[PDB]
Design a protein around this nucleic acid. Structure first.
Ligand SMILES: [Mn+2]
Ligand SMILES: [Mn+2]
Ligand SMILES: [Mn+2]
Ligand SMILES: [Mn+2]
Ligand SMILES: [Mn+2]
Ligand SMILES: [Mn+2]
Ligand SMILES: [Mn+2]
Ligand SMILES: [Mn+2]
Ligand SMILES: [Mn+2]
Ligand SMILES: [Mn+2]
Ligand SMILES: [Mn+2]
Lengths: 94, 107, 98, 86, 94, 105, 100, 79
DNA sequence: ATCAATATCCACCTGCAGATTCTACCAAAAGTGTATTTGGAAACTGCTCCATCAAAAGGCATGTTCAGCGGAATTCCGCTGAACATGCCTTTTGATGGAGCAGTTTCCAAATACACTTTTGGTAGAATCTGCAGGTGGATATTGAT
DNA sequence: ATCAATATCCACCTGCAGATTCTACCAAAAGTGTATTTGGAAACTGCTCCATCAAAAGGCATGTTCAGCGGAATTCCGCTGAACATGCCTTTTGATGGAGCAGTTTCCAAATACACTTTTGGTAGAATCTGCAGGTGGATATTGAT
């Protein structure tokens, strides 16, 4: 009967930007819907992108173009940096 | 042996994101960098809303962020307002806003 | 015998409701309306109580935004009073009506 | 057994409740004919959403409309709702 | 260089409805966009339905509920009736 | 002999099957799904061709052009709603002048 | 022998009647083609366009402006005018949710 | 300039087709501004699809995909 | 009501851009039988949570009275746009070579995925902790009469 | 502007519902080793994209004039806001019966990938095919002056 939620990660990020602020269960539910919603939007644009180009794989490149098509100007710029940074850092290990 | 999140420098779960991408029937295959890049974007957008919601909570002298603080944060920010332009936040209310012609007469 | 002028209490009302987030239609009457409409599509349906609340949060958000657009339509016509033709123009421009 | 009969419940959406929604919407003056007009727009809105929610319910072979059925119905109509598992 | 399209089938249907009416190439192109558009909307809704209910199969049932969610009243009623007739007429074969 | 014929259809059941399997819609595709889908597509196509055909005959033309498709769809309440967010190239619009604009008679 | 002139609004009505009957593009092509390349150039320099791509852009832009003008007309008439103004277009876009 | 190349008469025709009878003089510049915003939004996405496929030629399909995701689906150019 | 300037309509005529039929290619598909798997339907069933109602308690809906002031009819007239005619700048179409750059095939190395199987990062439930809803009261602020 | 009826803000006060912390299981992440592919790089060809001269002339731009639209000012009927009195019905909290729903277990019909075989669907030199766009004549309608 269990059910995953992004709650613990949303909470970690909250502690990082506002160390002394908590969050109600209804706000957290809103935050979880938001993450799920953005995940589907980006995954769907990436899925579409791959099909249009006849590729059978979704790579970081499709996520990047998808983020670029989905987010408004400035949020797109910062998301791409954070995404690119994470990939490069992940690639530099192991 | 480090988690993929840690290795990526993220708080959001790379492994879980990878699996959700796999079970979503988005493509036949999912490259290893896709969930990392996607997890970072999700974590960035949530840090962005929480920063602004947290400030809204402090402005109303509150320690706990509630739905109204998320709505104030999204509706007062041009870009988030656009990203969530067709989204309704339960218990968020609306921004105070009264048309000028409606105000009591003079000036 | 004190009296606020017409428009004075309406403005205080706008300030008070734009400040809160509480649902504005009574709960039981809205729940009966939902059951009645649903019963007309399919008899014997039950409802999780959170399904009714979700319908009420969506319905109120939709009407509040519709009144905002309706009000802009009234003001465009040099009025401060909304009328059925304002709501109809708004719904037509929104594509909710032919 | 025997659930009482439901009829005329749209009148349960009162004139006072309608002025409140309008206040929240920034409206200062309301014509007498607005109330019936609003009631008619609300019914159309509920019918459309409840119809789709019940369609999701029936497809799942259930008899209970879940919050998820309502959330998916609002989503497909482009009225995405956050806060109920959706 | 082969490029598939529904052109020959749309033409076959045009003949059953209006034996003496032809169609321009631009109109055919519009009809091809139409079939592709409805195919995607219906298949997409069917995919979501199966995912919402945790099944890995898209059956005539998901297609049917999809059509019901997507098409307006009467059109829905007739499409379901054609879809059901076609499945029956196909199971009643050797 | 031919999946389309066993179903009583002109639209290609096999092609639809393949489009469904390769579209990433789900892991598996039921055998009847492409049958039902193809029939729905054929029906909608006929519905539009039937009305576009009538529009062609009304303007005294034998060949259906985009204009006839637009006239067919916008004059029909239901197709207009289904295609509510679609633009038919070279379709033009329905003749329609607001009454308050007509000269005083 | 001749003087003659139609009243204001009479030719405007024949033009509506004539343009609602036809389906041809109403903005000149070359000027449109230039607008398009100019705008594309601000996003990525040295691009080429298939000719059908410029056409798709024109059909879409024209169908959009035409539907916007219909909504704009309803806003002018609502205010009891038969003349559309910038404020009518702004109201139509605001309600449509295109922002003002 | 280019946007200026979209003429008053062309703007008037589009309006006639829209059933408009009388046009104020400030309408022409207002329209031009709306057309440019519309084109920027669609061309931006089409070019983004062009770059993604590593091309230097904007295709009809690129425009069609861009119109579709902006909720302006267009029939007649493929897809 | 009487002209007369122009617009609009119908019948007919015919070349040709674009449509329907001929046709042979041929890679591509659609499809049939088989051996492997598994997705998901009854039947059973624990037990969540939904429907229903009653008492108590008071918030808030209903219905009336009174009159402030909003909306809209009428009149008027300034000046913005529509109509039109003059002048010519610029689009449009087609014949026309120069070249950018799509998109196909082949070779092949990096990079997937699925079954194994080891280890732990979440999740649900129990325990532990605390923000703020809502009442009180009181100083300051806003309205509206005079 | 002066004073009175009222509402608004806000800071302290406090029990508690709701949130943040501690615990022992288990889906579900994370290394290996094959076995298998996707799709990139490059050489390469030819589809169409670009830039352009050159007639033909179709529209745009400018300017003049004035018909009539839109909006300001004034007026006043009656609609809708404010407020009051009365009491109905919503809300909150339990209390109970049980309708349904979801989580194992068992197992048969149905789907997949491979492999192999026959043909439909796409293409295009082919061209004959042909609907109807445009152009003309001549009859009648529409419009707007007088
Ligand atoms: Mn009923
Ligand atoms: Mn007034
Ligand atoms: Mn070079
Ligand atoms: Mn641990
Ligand atoms: Mn308080
Ligand atoms: Mn390959
Ligand atoms: Mn007037
Ligand atoms: Mn009462
Ligand atoms: Mn064949
Ligand atoms: Mn003709
Ligand atoms: Mn003649």
């Amino acid at each position: 009967t269990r059910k995953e939620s992004y709650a613990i990660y949303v909470y970690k990020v909250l502690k990082q930007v506002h160390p002394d602020t908590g969050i109600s269960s209804k706000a957290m539910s809103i935050m979880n819907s938001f993450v799920n919603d953005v995940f589907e939007r980006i995954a769907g644009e990436a899925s579409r992108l791959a099909h249009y180009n006849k590729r059978s794989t979704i790579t970081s490149r499709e996520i990047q173009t998808a983020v670029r098509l989905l987010l408004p100007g400035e949020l797109a710029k910062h998301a791409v940096s954070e995404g690119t940074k994470a990939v490069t850092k992940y690639t530099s290990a192991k | 042996a480090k988690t993929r999140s840690s290795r990526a420098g993220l708080q959001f779960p790379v492994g879980r994101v990878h699996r959700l991408l796999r079970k979503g029937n988005y493509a036949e295959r999912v490259g290893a960098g896709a969930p990392v890049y996607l997890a970072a974007v999700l974590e960035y957008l949530t840090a962005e809303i929480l920063e602004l919601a947290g400030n809204a909570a402090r402005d109303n002298k509150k320690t706990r962020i509630i739905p109204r603080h998320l709505q104030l944060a999204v509706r007062n920010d041009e870009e988030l307002n656009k990203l969530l332009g067709r989204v309704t936040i339960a218990q968020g209310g609306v921004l105070p806003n009264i048309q000028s012609v409606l105000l009591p007469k003079k000036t | 015998p004190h009296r606020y002028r017409p428009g004075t209490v309406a403005l205080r009302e706008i300030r008070r409701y734009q400040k809160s987030t509480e649902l504005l239609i009574r709960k039981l009457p809205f729940q009966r309306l939902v059951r009645e409409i649903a019963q007309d599509f399919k008899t014997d349906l039950r409802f999780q109580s959170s399904a009714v609340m979700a319908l009420q949060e969506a319905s109120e958000a939709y009407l509040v935004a519709l009144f905002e657009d309706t009000n802009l339509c009234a003001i465009h016509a040099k009025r401060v009073t909304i009328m059925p033709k304002d709501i109809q123009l708004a719904r037509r421009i929104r594509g909710e009506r032919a | 057994r025997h659930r009482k009969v439901l009829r005329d419940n749209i009148q349960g959406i009162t004139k006072p409740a309608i002025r409140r929604l309008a206040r929240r919407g920034g409206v200062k003056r309301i014509s007498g004919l607005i109330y019936e007009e609003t009631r008619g727009v609300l019914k159309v809105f509920l019918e459309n959403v409840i119809r789709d929610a019940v369609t999701y319910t029936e497809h799942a072979k259930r008899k209970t409309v879940t919050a998820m059925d309502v959330v998916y119905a609002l989503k497909r109509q482009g009225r995405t709702l956050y806060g109920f598992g959706g």
